[PDB]
Amino acid sequence: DCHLSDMLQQLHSVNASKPSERGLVRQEEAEDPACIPIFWVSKWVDYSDKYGLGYQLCDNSVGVLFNDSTRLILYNDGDSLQYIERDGTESYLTVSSHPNSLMKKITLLKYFRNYMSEHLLKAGANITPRRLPYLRTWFRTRSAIILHLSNGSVQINFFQDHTKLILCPLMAAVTYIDEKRDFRTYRLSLLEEYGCCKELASRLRYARTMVDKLLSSR
């Protein structure tokens, strides 16, 4: 796939520049507003033992990648749906149309929505952004969950300190959410030029290994 291999080269480039080892790091000069992401995952629920993975995007739409490799998205109007078949065929319908064949999946998505609404907090709820994607694939390690969106964006959420990266290969940009929920969006090639802090550098090193894993899968 194109977007992942571009992302890999982009990450390699920044990491090969050893950006945290500059005399003076000038991270702020690498900031670029035109590169702020439009979509990212604000909440997620791993029910992969039985059903699949539920998630909410920053616009309050919710999606599920089911164990059977199909996907369902509920738009933030709370009635419109997009169903994506195993083979990639997408169709639009409504919850209120009550399609008997999809009622199980609709019920499961509503459960995920309701659970995330009452029991999880929204990630990146303060971000000012600059079609809706679905979750292509995901996996987790001991320290992070990795989410690959259909627009090419890769998001990595670190468990131990609540930090997050949103990587976009189209904009060649990374958005970093630190422990304080402070966020900044950087052009990768400008990080090469101006440097960055040790903690973003280490997470970009981790990100590269994660993109390797996604590619070797694929």
PDB file of C-alpha atoms in Angstrom:
ATOM      1  CA  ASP A   1       0.000   0.000   0.000  1.00  0.00           C
ATOM      2  CA  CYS A   2       1.087   3.534  -0.948  1.00  0.00           C
ATOM      3  CA  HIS A   3       0.124   5.588   2.119  1.00  0.00           C
ATOM      4  CA  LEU A   4       1.898   3.274   4.604  1.00  0.00           C
ATOM      5  CA  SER A   5       5.142   3.067   2.589  1.00  0.00           C
ATOM      6  CA  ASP A   6       5.192   6.884   2.237  1.00  0.00           C
ATOM      7  CA  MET A   7       4.574   7.158   5.982  1.00  0.00           C
ATOM      8  CA  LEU A   8       7.481   4.766   6.609  1.00  0.00           C
ATOM      9  CA  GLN A   9       9.906   6.818   4.506  1.00  0.00           C
ATOM     10  CA  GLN A  10       8.706  10.046   6.153  1.00  0.00           C
ATOM     11  CA  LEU A  11       9.280   8.607   9.631  1.00  0.00           C
ATOM     12  CA  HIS A  12      12.624   7.115   8.664  1.00  0.00           C
ATOM     13  CA  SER A  13      13.749  10.540   7.369  1.00  0.00           C
ATOM     14  CA  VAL A  14      12.935  12.395  10.608  1.00  0.00           C
ATOM     15  CA  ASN A  15      14.429   9.624  12.817  1.00  0.00           C
ATOM     16  CA  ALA A  16      17.601   9.478  10.654  1.00  0.00           C
ATOM     17  CA  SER A  17      18.090  13.218  11.310  1.00  0.00           C
ATOM     18  CA  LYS A  18      18.302  12.521  15.099  1.00  0.00           C
ATOM     19  CA  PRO A  19      16.068  15.583  15.758  1.00  0.00           C
ATOM     20  CA  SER A  20      16.463  15.615  19.538  1.00  0.00           C
ATOM     21  CA  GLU A  21      20.289  15.959  19.263  1.00  0.00           C
ATOM     22  CA  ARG A  22      20.458  19.528  17.897  1.00  0.00           C
ATOM     23  CA  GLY A  23      22.367  22.273  19.756  1.00  0.00           C
ATOM     24  CA  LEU A  24      19.154  24.259  20.071  1.00  0.00           C
ATOM     25  CA  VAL A  25      15.854  22.525  19.317  1.00  0.00           C
ATOM     26  CA  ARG A  26      13.333  24.883  17.704  1.00  0.00           C
ATOM     27  CA  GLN A  27      10.232  22.680  17.541  1.00  0.00           C
ATOM     28  CA  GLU A  28       7.876  25.690  17.243  1.00  0.00           C
ATOM     29  CA  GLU A  29       9.218  26.576  13.784  1.00  0.00           C
ATOM     30  CA  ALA A  30       8.026  23.151  12.526  1.00  0.00           C
ATOM     31  CA  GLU A  31       4.401  23.882  13.466  1.00  0.00           C
ATOM     32  CA  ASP A  32       2.004  24.069  10.516  1.00  0.00           C
ATOM     33  CA  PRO A  33      -1.735  24.923  10.892  1.00  0.00           C
ATOM     34  CA  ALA A  34      -2.574  23.909   7.296  1.00  0.00           C
ATOM     35  CA  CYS A  35      -1.611  20.344   8.330  1.00  0.00           C
ATOM     36  CA  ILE A  36      -3.928  19.893  11.353  1.00  0.00           C
ATOM     37  CA  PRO A  37      -5.893  16.626  10.933  1.00  0.00           C
ATOM     38  CA  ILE A  38      -9.607  16.597  10.134  1.00  0.00           C
ATOM     39  CA  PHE A  39     -10.335  13.166  11.653  1.00  0.00           C
ATOM     40  CA  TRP A  40      -8.988  11.159  14.577  1.00  0.00           C
ATOM     41  CA  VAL A  41     -10.227   8.549  17.075  1.00  0.00           C
ATOM     42  CA  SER A  42     -11.484  10.159  20.283  1.00  0.00           C
ATOM     43  CA  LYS A  43     -12.636   6.956  22.109  1.00  0.00           C
ATOM     44  CA  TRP A  44     -12.275   3.204  21.597  1.00  0.00           C
ATOM     45  CA  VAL A  45     -13.525  -0.116  23.042  1.00  0.00           C
ATOM     46  CA  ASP A  46     -11.794  -3.465  22.446  1.00  0.00           C
ATOM     47  CA  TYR A  47     -14.482  -6.161  22.469  1.00  0.00           C
ATOM     48  CA  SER A  48     -12.440  -8.304  20.046  1.00  0.00           C
ATOM     49  CA  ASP A  49     -12.923 -11.542  21.989  1.00  0.00           C
ATOM     50  CA  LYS A  50     -16.537 -11.708  20.762  1.00  0.00           C
ATOM     51  CA  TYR A  51     -17.663  -8.840  18.492  1.00  0.00           C
ATOM     52  CA  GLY A  52     -14.917  -6.463  17.378  1.00  0.00           C
ATOM     53  CA  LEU A  53     -13.524  -3.020  18.040  1.00  0.00           C
ATOM     54  CA  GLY A  54     -15.800  -0.013  18.572  1.00  0.00           C
ATOM     55  CA  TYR A  55     -14.554   3.565  18.169  1.00  0.00           C
ATOM     56  CA  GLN A  56     -15.748   7.147  18.089  1.00  0.00           C
ATOM     57  CA  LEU A  57     -14.324   9.832  15.770  1.00  0.00           C
ATOM     58  CA  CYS A  58     -13.812  13.473  16.819  1.00  0.00           C
ATOM     59  CA  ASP A  59     -17.164  14.440  15.175  1.00  0.00           C
ATOM     60  CA  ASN A  60     -19.160  12.041  17.474  1.00  0.00           C
ATOM     61  CA  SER A  61     -19.805   9.508  14.709  1.00  0.00           C
ATOM     62  CA  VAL A  62     -19.136   5.964  15.862  1.00  0.00           C
ATOM     63  CA  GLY A  63     -17.836   2.961  13.971  1.00  0.00           C
ATOM     64  CA  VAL A  64     -17.160  -0.717  14.489  1.00  0.00           C
ATOM     65  CA  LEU A  65     -14.790  -3.087  12.757  1.00  0.00           C
ATOM     66  CA  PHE A  66     -16.492  -6.424  13.413  1.00  0.00           C
ATOM     67  CA  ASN A  67     -14.615  -9.728  13.806  1.00  0.00           C
ATOM     68  CA  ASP A  68     -16.149 -10.874  10.474  1.00  0.00           C
ATOM     69  CA  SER A  69     -14.218  -8.070   8.725  1.00  0.00           C
ATOM     70  CA  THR A  70     -17.284  -5.929   7.987  1.00  0.00           C
ATOM     71  CA  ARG A  71     -17.701  -2.350   9.144  1.00  0.00           C
ATOM     72  CA  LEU A  72     -20.588  -0.214  10.295  1.00  0.00           C
ATOM     73  CA  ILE A  73     -20.611   3.556  10.802  1.00  0.00           C
ATOM     74  CA  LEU A  74     -23.276   5.614  12.524  1.00  0.00           C
ATOM     75  CA  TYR A  75     -23.216   9.296  11.598  1.00  0.00           C
ATOM     76  CA  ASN A  76     -23.599  11.943  14.280  1.00  0.00           C
ATOM     77  CA  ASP A  77     -27.232  12.555  13.245  1.00  0.00           C
ATOM     78  CA  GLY A  78     -27.810   9.261  15.098  1.00  0.00           C
ATOM     79  CA  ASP A  79     -29.848   7.633  12.314  1.00  0.00           C
ATOM     80  CA  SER A  80     -27.696   7.488   9.138  1.00  0.00           C
ATOM     81  CA  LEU A  81     -25.517   4.406   8.566  1.00  0.00           C
ATOM     82  CA  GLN A  82     -22.771   3.273   6.232  1.00  0.00           C
ATOM     83  CA  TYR A  83     -22.238  -0.466   5.914  1.00  0.00           C
ATOM     84  CA  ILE A  84     -19.057  -1.740   4.304  1.00  0.00           C
ATOM     85  CA  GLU A  85     -19.111  -5.381   3.198  1.00  0.00           C
ATOM     86  CA  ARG A  86     -16.188  -7.834   3.429  1.00  0.00           C
ATOM     87  CA  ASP A  87     -15.245  -7.129  -0.207  1.00  0.00           C
ATOM     88  CA  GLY A  88     -15.348  -3.325   0.197  1.00  0.00           C
ATOM     89  CA  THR A  89     -18.850  -2.680  -1.208  1.00  0.00           C
ATOM     90  CA  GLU A  90     -20.341   0.257   0.725  1.00  0.00           C
ATOM     91  CA  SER A  91     -24.039   1.096   1.083  1.00  0.00           C
ATOM     92  CA  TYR A  92     -26.002   3.725   2.976  1.00  0.00           C
ATOM     93  CA  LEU A  93     -29.160   3.184   4.992  1.00  0.00           C
ATOM     94  CA  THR A  94     -30.933   4.300   8.113  1.00  0.00           C
ATOM     95  CA  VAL A  95     -31.401   2.744  11.593  1.00  0.00           C
ATOM     96  CA  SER A  96     -35.098   3.688  11.513  1.00  0.00           C
ATOM     97  CA  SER A  97     -35.556   1.632   8.282  1.00  0.00           C
ATOM     98  CA  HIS A  98     -35.072  -1.382  10.588  1.00  0.00           C
ATOM     99  CA  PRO A  99     -33.181  -3.760   8.233  1.00  0.00           C
ATOM    100  CA  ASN A 100     -33.695  -7.230   9.734  1.00  0.00           C
ATOM    101  CA  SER A 101     -30.401  -8.570   8.354  1.00  0.00           C
ATOM    102  CA  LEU A 102     -28.324  -5.847  10.091  1.00  0.00           C
ATOM    103  CA  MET A 103     -30.253  -5.505  13.361  1.00  0.00           C
ATOM    104  CA  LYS A 104     -27.687  -7.512  15.369  1.00  0.00           C
ATOM    105  CA  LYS A 105     -24.823  -5.315  14.151  1.00  0.00           C
ATOM    106  CA  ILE A 106     -26.880  -2.115  14.673  1.00  0.00           C
ATOM    107  CA  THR A 107     -27.630  -3.244  18.255  1.00  0.00           C
ATOM    108  CA  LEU A 108     -23.922  -3.917  18.866  1.00  0.00           C
ATOM    109  CA  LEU A 109     -22.916  -0.489  17.512  1.00  0.00           C
ATOM    110  CA  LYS A 110     -25.536   1.239  19.724  1.00  0.00           C
ATOM    111  CA  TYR A 111     -24.112  -0.607  22.727  1.00  0.00           C
ATOM    112  CA  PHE A 112     -20.579   0.628  21.842  1.00  0.00           C
ATOM    113  CA  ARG A 113     -21.879   4.176  21.352  1.00  0.00           C
ATOM    114  CA  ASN A 114     -23.736   4.209  24.692  1.00  0.00           C
ATOM    115  CA  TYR A 115     -20.803   2.653  26.594  1.00  0.00           C
ATOM    116  CA  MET A 116     -18.301   5.181  25.177  1.00  0.00           C
ATOM    117  CA  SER A 117     -20.663   8.051  25.903  1.00  0.00           C
ATOM    118  CA  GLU A 118     -21.073   7.233  29.608  1.00  0.00           C
ATOM    119  CA  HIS A 119     -17.764   5.607  30.568  1.00  0.00           C
ATOM    120  CA  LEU A 120     -14.917   7.122  28.485  1.00  0.00           C
ATOM    121  CA  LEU A 121     -13.522  10.653  28.015  1.00  0.00           C
ATOM    122  CA  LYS A 122     -13.048  12.299  24.602  1.00  0.00           C
ATOM    123  CA  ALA A 123      -9.443  12.502  23.321  1.00  0.00           C
ATOM    124  CA  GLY A 124      -8.468  15.715  21.509  1.00  0.00           C
ATOM    125  CA  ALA A 125     -11.752  17.460  22.412  1.00  0.00           C
ATOM    126  CA  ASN A 126      -9.962  20.840  22.310  1.00  0.00           C
ATOM    127  CA  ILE A 127      -8.417  20.537  18.818  1.00  0.00           C
ATOM    128  CA  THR A 128      -9.403  23.047  16.097  1.00  0.00           C
ATOM    129  CA  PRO A 129      -9.404  21.143  12.771  1.00  0.00           C
ATOM    130  CA  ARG A 130      -8.375  22.568   9.386  1.00  0.00           C
ATOM    131  CA  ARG A 131     -15.669  12.367   3.706  1.00  0.00           C
ATOM    132  CA  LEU A 132     -15.682  10.203   6.818  1.00  0.00           C
ATOM    133  CA  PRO A 133     -13.038   7.471   7.103  1.00  0.00           C
ATOM    134  CA  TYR A 134     -13.418   3.976   8.552  1.00  0.00           C
ATOM    135  CA  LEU A 135     -11.013   1.841  10.529  1.00  0.00           C
ATOM    136  CA  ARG A 136      -8.956  -0.253   8.098  1.00  0.00           C
ATOM    137  CA  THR A 137      -7.032  -2.213  10.688  1.00  0.00           C
ATOM    138  CA  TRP A 138      -5.714  -2.109  14.240  1.00  0.00           C
ATOM    139  CA  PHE A 139      -3.578  -3.966  16.714  1.00  0.00           C
ATOM    140  CA  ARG A 140      -2.209  -3.440  20.156  1.00  0.00           C
ATOM    141  CA  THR A 141       1.080  -3.973  21.985  1.00  0.00           C
ATOM    142  CA  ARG A 142       1.859  -3.810  25.715  1.00  0.00           C
ATOM    143  CA  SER A 143       2.322  -0.023  25.553  1.00  0.00           C
ATOM    144  CA  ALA A 144       0.001   1.212  22.783  1.00  0.00           C
ATOM    145  CA  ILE A 145      -3.010   0.744  20.515  1.00  0.00           C
ATOM    146  CA  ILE A 146      -2.386   1.423  16.811  1.00  0.00           C
ATOM    147  CA  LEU A 147      -5.273   2.456  14.546  1.00  0.00           C
ATOM    148  CA  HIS A 148      -5.057   2.708  10.751  1.00  0.00           C
ATOM    149  CA  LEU A 149      -7.791   4.800   9.124  1.00  0.00           C
ATOM    150  CA  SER A 150      -9.042   4.515   5.544  1.00  0.00           C
ATOM    151  CA  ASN A 151      -7.732   8.022   4.727  1.00  0.00           C
ATOM    152  CA  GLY A 152      -4.148   6.780   5.323  1.00  0.00           C
ATOM    153  CA  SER A 153      -3.915   8.298   8.810  1.00  0.00           C
ATOM    154  CA  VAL A 154      -2.259   6.226  11.552  1.00  0.00           C
ATOM    155  CA  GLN A 155      -2.975   6.956  15.218  1.00  0.00           C
ATOM    156  CA  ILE A 156      -1.020   5.543  18.170  1.00  0.00           C
ATOM    157  CA  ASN A 157      -2.308   5.892  21.729  1.00  0.00           C
ATOM    158  CA  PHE A 158       0.225   5.178  24.482  1.00  0.00           C
ATOM    159  CA  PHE A 159      -1.344   3.500  27.553  1.00  0.00           C
ATOM    160  CA  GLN A 160       1.206   4.413  30.259  1.00  0.00           C
ATOM    161  CA  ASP A 161       1.043   8.216  29.966  1.00  0.00           C
ATOM    162  CA  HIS A 162      -2.035   8.958  27.788  1.00  0.00           C
ATOM    163  CA  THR A 163       0.070  10.507  24.971  1.00  0.00           C
ATOM    164  CA  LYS A 164      -1.028  10.161  21.349  1.00  0.00           C
ATOM    165  CA  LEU A 165       0.328  10.587  17.826  1.00  0.00           C
ATOM    166  CA  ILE A 166      -1.765  11.178  14.717  1.00  0.00           C
ATOM    167  CA  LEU A 167       0.377  10.660  11.607  1.00  0.00           C
ATOM    168  CA  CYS A 168      -0.830  11.710   8.167  1.00  0.00           C
ATOM    169  CA  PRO A 169       1.163  10.639   5.073  1.00  0.00           C
ATOM    170  CA  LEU A 170      -0.790  12.982   2.754  1.00  0.00           C
ATOM    171  CA  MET A 171       0.208  16.108   4.729  1.00  0.00           C
ATOM    172  CA  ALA A 172       3.498  14.480   5.873  1.00  0.00           C
ATOM    173  CA  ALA A 173       2.581  15.685   9.336  1.00  0.00           C
ATOM    174  CA  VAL A 174       2.379  14.514  12.949  1.00  0.00           C
ATOM    175  CA  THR A 175       0.024  15.761  15.634  1.00  0.00           C
ATOM    176  CA  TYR A 176       1.260  15.152  19.150  1.00  0.00           C
ATOM    177  CA  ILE A 177      -0.984  15.083  22.217  1.00  0.00           C
ATOM    178  CA  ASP A 178       1.154  15.293  25.373  1.00  0.00           C
ATOM    179  CA  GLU A 179       0.238  14.280  28.956  1.00  0.00           C
ATOM    180  CA  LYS A 180      -1.247  17.753  29.644  1.00  0.00           C
ATOM    181  CA  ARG A 181      -3.600  17.248  26.653  1.00  0.00           C
ATOM    182  CA  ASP A 182      -1.677  20.077  24.973  1.00  0.00           C
ATOM    183  CA  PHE A 183      -1.499  19.450  21.239  1.00  0.00           C
ATOM    184  CA  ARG A 184       0.647  20.629  18.322  1.00  0.00           C
ATOM    185  CA  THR A 185       0.788  19.685  14.642  1.00  0.00           C
ATOM    186  CA  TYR A 186       4.231  19.541  12.952  1.00  0.00           C
ATOM    187  CA  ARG A 187       5.442  19.073   9.404  1.00  0.00           C
ATOM    188  CA  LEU A 188       7.833  16.088   9.552  1.00  0.00           C
ATOM    189  CA  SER A 189      10.344  17.582   7.080  1.00  0.00           C
ATOM    190  CA  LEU A 190      10.462  20.698   9.301  1.00  0.00           C
ATOM    191  CA  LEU A 191      11.214  18.559  12.350  1.00  0.00           C
ATOM    192  CA  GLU A 192      14.206  17.334  10.339  1.00  0.00           C
ATOM    193  CA  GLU A 193      15.301  20.962   9.912  1.00  0.00           C
ATOM    194  CA  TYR A 194      14.538  22.446  13.340  1.00  0.00           C
ATOM    195  CA  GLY A 195      14.663  19.456  15.696  1.00  0.00           C
ATOM    196  CA  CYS A 196      12.207  18.318  18.374  1.00  0.00           C
ATOM    197  CA  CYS A 197      12.051  17.344  22.044  1.00  0.00           C
ATOM    198  CA  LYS A 198      13.256  13.933  23.283  1.00  0.00           C
ATOM    199  CA  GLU A 199       9.752  12.651  24.034  1.00  0.00           C
ATOM    200  CA  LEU A 200       8.319  13.298  20.570  1.00  0.00           C
ATOM    201  CA  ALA A 201      11.539  11.866  19.070  1.00  0.00           C
ATOM    202  CA  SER A 202      11.196   8.611  21.071  1.00  0.00           C
ATOM    203  CA  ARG A 203       7.523   8.258  20.108  1.00  0.00           C
ATOM    204  CA  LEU A 204       8.373   8.806  16.426  1.00  0.00           C
ATOM    205  CA  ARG A 205      10.947   6.021  16.761  1.00  0.00           C
ATOM    206  CA  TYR A 206       8.194   3.814  18.186  1.00  0.00           C
ATOM    207  CA  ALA A 207       5.812   4.926  15.398  1.00  0.00           C
ATOM    208  CA  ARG A 208       8.277   3.751  12.730  1.00  0.00           C
ATOM    209  CA  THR A 209       8.400   0.234  14.255  1.00  0.00           C
ATOM    210  CA  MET A 210       4.550   0.232  14.286  1.00  0.00           C
ATOM    211  CA  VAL A 211       4.319   1.208  10.586  1.00  0.00           C
ATOM    212  CA  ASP A 212       6.830  -1.601   9.842  1.00  0.00           C
ATOM    213  CA  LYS A 213       4.385  -4.018  11.571  1.00  0.00           C
ATOM    214  CA  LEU A 214       1.382  -2.752   9.559  1.00  0.00           C
ATOM    215  CA  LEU A 215       3.322  -3.163   6.313  1.00  0.00           C
ATOM    216  CA  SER A 216       4.645  -6.652   7.091  1.00  0.00           C
ATOM    217  CA  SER A 217       0.998  -7.597   7.710  1.00  0.00           C
ATOM    218  CA  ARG A 218      -0.136  -6.190   4.344  1.00  0.00           C
TER     219      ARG A 218
END
